[PDB]
Amino acid sequence: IPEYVDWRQKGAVTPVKNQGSCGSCWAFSAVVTIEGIIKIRTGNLNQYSEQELLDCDRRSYGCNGGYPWSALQLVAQYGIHYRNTYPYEGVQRYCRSREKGPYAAKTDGVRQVQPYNQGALLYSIANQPVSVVLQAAGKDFQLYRGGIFVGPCGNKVDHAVAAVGYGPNYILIKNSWGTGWGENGYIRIKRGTGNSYGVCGLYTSSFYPVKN
Ligand SMILES: *CC(=O)[C@H](C)NC(=O)[C@H](Cc1ccccc1)NC(=O)OCc1ccccc1
């Protein structure tokens, strides 16, 4: 369980993206999750469509609300297309999955990490990236243009992102905003403080598919 875990230089995460004026956090976080695992075994890095997840997942409320843990489940159940055969537009619409044709990616299950346990988060993040939530409605996290976020912030979780590494002290997160935020679309939050919930409630509820 290395002292350092970066999947970027591991060839697991692709360039950064933006959800835009679309409250669709959840589908983006997922595509990165599934994505990671998909490349971890096969040795093939891919960019899947979040747009599809939006238009297809009726359980989620597309362009403004969702469950990073429906998306995944969805995929495993059905599947998910490339981000070319289903590029992101930013507006929820009619499911094209079927109309689009044969799927391209399809997992083999979804599991959740025991909330409120850093030790647990890491491990999984060590075996493969994960979808995690937190407080973004933040007025500080909103302004982050590079650094180690300690706060201030709260325990009112409401935005989903992704963890793509950690250090002895900083946890790495991929944001669904442009590369005109944090440190090039990236933000480092601090771990090991005692805060069980985890600063910004980053330890509330996390997840991930399964792959054979
Ligand atoms: C980040 C974003 O674009 C939208 C506005 N918010 C969400 O998708 C959240 C994700 C989340 C899940 C768990 C904990 C924190 C955030 N999802 C969401 O609010 O949908 C839930 C819901 C919406 C409307 C009515 C009932 C429940």
For residue 104, the domain's CATH number is 3.90.70.10
**131 Cβ contact partners less than 8 Å away, ≥ 6 residues apart:** 26, 29, 30, 32, 33, 68, 69, 72, 160, 161, 162, 206, 207, 208
Give the Å distances, CA to CA, from 53 to 23, 37, 90, 108, 168: 13, 18, 11, 17, 35
Experimental method: X-ray
Question: Across the chain, how many H-helices and E-strands are there?
Answer: 5, 8
CB 13 within 8 A of CB 26: no
Which residue bears the tokens 């999947």?
7
Radius of gyration of the chain (CA): 16
Mutate which of 67, 70, 88, 175 for ligand 1 pocket (most atoms within 8 A of beta carbon)? 67
The tally of domains found in the chain comes to 1
Residue 89 lies in domain? 1-212
Q: What is the spatial distance between Cα 202 and Cα 163, in angstroms, rounded to a whole number?
A: 10
Mutate which of 158, 200, 202 for ligand 1 pocket (most atoms within 8 A of beta carbon)? 158
End-to-end CA distance of the chain: 22
Q: What is the spatial distance between Cα 53 and Cα 71, in angstroms, rounded to a whole number?
A: 6
Q: Burial-class residue 101 by CB neighbours within 10 Å (0-12, 13-18, 19+).
A: exposed
Q: Burial-class residue 23 by CB neighbours within 10 Å (0-12, 13-18, 19+).
A: middle
Of 73, 4, 28, the closest CA to residue 177 belongs to 28
Resolution in A: 2.8
DSSP 172: E
**64 Cβ contact partners less than 8 Å away, ≥ 6 residues apart:** 22, 23, 24
Does the beta carbon of 160 lie inside 6 Å of ligand 1?
yes
Q: What are the helix (H) ranges across the chain?
A: 25-41, 50-56, 68-77, 97-100, 118-127
Give the Å distances, CA to CA, from 90 to 22, 52, 57, 80, 95: 6, 10, 14, 17, 14
Q: What is the spatial distance between Cα 193 and Cα 38, in angstroms, rounded to a whole number?
A: 33
